[PDB]
Swiss-Prot record, chain B:
Taxonomic classification: Viruses, Duplodnaviria, Heunggongvirae, Uroviricota, Caudoviricetes
Function in brief: Component of the cylindrical core that assembles on the inner surface of the capsid during capsid formation and plays a role in viral DNA ejection into the host cell. The inner core is composed of stacked rings of gp14, gp15 and gp16 proteins. Following binding to the host cell surface, the internal core is disassembled and gp15 is ejected along with gp14 and gp16 into the infected cell. Gp15 probably remains associated with gp16.
Name of protein: Internal virion protein gp15
Organism: Escherichia phage T7 (Bacteriophage T7)
Range of the intact protein held here: 123 to 200 of 747
Quaternary organization: Homooctamer. Interacts with gp16; after ejection the gp15-gp16 complex composed of a gp15 octamer and a gp16 tetramer probably binds both the viral DNA and the host inner membrane. Interacts with gp14.
Localization terms from the record: Virion; Host periplasm
Family from the record: Belongs to the T7virus internal virion protein gp15 family.
Highest taxon of source: Viruses
Length: 78, 78
């Protein structure tokens, strides 16, 4: 983490997290459809547990706390 | 090997130079037929050893200086 600079390591981990969502479009499709079918539930309180579900299946593919664009989908969804 | 960066010190370049001098003075002779201890062979083989050594030492101390800079940076971060 210190050969490559701090800033460059941050960029690196951001890229390593968000690359597995534009290298395979199955992940992109699946997550975007779950997000959108979670914004269209009738009860707003039952959309929030769907959104915590999505935020729970993002922590299995992006394990570092940088601001990947998928963590922007979830923020706009909430 | 000097300007590629294999020897990190001066002692390793010194030992490598010395040993390869001996093994080459033998191998090239026995490839060309000439006696390795021949007096005329060792007149053009060992011809101008100090100028060769000075050129090598210079083109290695350039490397030592740049390596010291790199290491000093990567050490002032840790």
């Amino acid at each position: 983490r210190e050969l490559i600079g701090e800033e460059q390591w941050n960029a690196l981990m951001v890229t390593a997290q968000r690359s597995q969502f534009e290298t395979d479009a199955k992940l992109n499709e699946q997550y975007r459809l779950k997000i959108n079918s979670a914004l269209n539930q009738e009860d707003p309180r039952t959309a929030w547990e769907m959104l915590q579900g999505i935020k729970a299946e993002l922590d299995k593919v992006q394990p570092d706390e940088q601001m990947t664009p998928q963590r922007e989908w979830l923020i706009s969804a909430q | 090997k000097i300007k590629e960066g294999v020897f990190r010190t001066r002692e390793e370049m010194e030992e490598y130079r010395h040993s390869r001098l001996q093994e080459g003075a033998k191998v090239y002779a026995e490839q060309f037929g000439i006696d390795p201890e021949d007096v005329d062979y060792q007149r053009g083989f060992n011809g101008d050893i100090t100028e060769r050594n000075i050129s090598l030492y210079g083109a290695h101390d350039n490397f030592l200086s740049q390596q010291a800079q790199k290491g000093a940076i990567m050490n002032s971060r840790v």
